[PDB]
From Swiss-Prot, chains A, B:
Protein name: Speckle-type POZ protein
Effect of L17D: Strongly reduced homodimerization. Reduces the activity of the cullin-RING-based BCR (BTB-CUL3-RBX1) E3 ubiquitin-protein ligase complex
Similarity section: Belongs to the Tdpoz family.
Gene designation per UniProt: SPOP
Residues of the full protein shown: 177 to 329 of 374
Domain of life: Eukaryota
Length: 153, 153
């Protein structure tokens, strides 16, 4: 225990990779905005992206994937999660991020959003959150939501 | 604290990326053996690979990088570290990995080897390890090797 070993920095460096966009091989177009990314990473991280890049006929697309169901700011948080496993701005978009994580099968990000939404459960938004968990198959969130509503009988 | 969030699995998934060799864009030839890899990840993880891929005039090289100064088994451990930040078999090759980590500027891996070597310091091997740390710029290893030798008077 004499030698001081530095903290793992895989996440920070992969984040650098995404921020610097080097050796990118695909373009994601989100509401008219273009983002360069790396197929290998997105595929190893999302079963949806994986399937998309693995079974895409029509070179006409030219590695150009157009995303229509996600707002640019939410998209960026999702990407941040894919490259580093973190989502610094999750708190202010938990519900939209949940839907994006669900759509792109990012299980851990999905549960992280569930965790944040659960923590904000109130009698004013209990029902809405409950419905939200049903539309994006967020089990843990639903259960905690049902329990909440019941308890407040 | 009601929702149970899974542990980050960035490393595991990036390891799968390397083990499955999907969407690779380069080839590393090591002592006759070929390994497919991803430029972006090697580049974001190693200043040497970074500079190598960033400045390579020969198309003739074809993203084909040949490594002559590293044994295949050691090379694989290095790659494992580059993709996941771990080196499960570092103990049986600490000295060789140290040199390989040094040559490719993998700072953290270099210190990890320094920690293993430092822990095996014995009257019998002390002198050999000290020299090893000087030839591969392993500062912490050196300082610990010099002290050991002194204390044993």
């Amino acid at each position: 225990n004499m030698v001081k070993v530095p903290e793992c920095r895989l996440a920070d460096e992969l984040g650098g990779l995404w921020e610097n966009s080097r050796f990118t091989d695909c373009c994601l177009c989100v509401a008219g905005q273009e983002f360069q990314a790396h197929k290998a990473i997105l595929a190893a991280r999302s079963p949806v992206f994986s399937a998309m890049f693995e079974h895409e006929m029509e070179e006409s697309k030219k590695n150009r994937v157009e995303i229509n169901d996600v707002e640019p700011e939410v998209f960026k948080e999702m990407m941040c999660f894919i490259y580093t496993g973190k989502a610094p701005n999750l708190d202010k978009m938990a519900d939209d991020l949940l839907a994006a994580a669900d759509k792109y099968a990012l299980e851990r990000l999905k549960v992280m959003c569930e965790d944040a939404l659960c923590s904000n459960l109130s009698v004013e938004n209990a029902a809405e959150i409950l419905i939200l968990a049903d539309l994006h198959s967020a089990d843990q969130l639903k259960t905690q939501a049902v329990d909440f509503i019941n308890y407040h009988a």
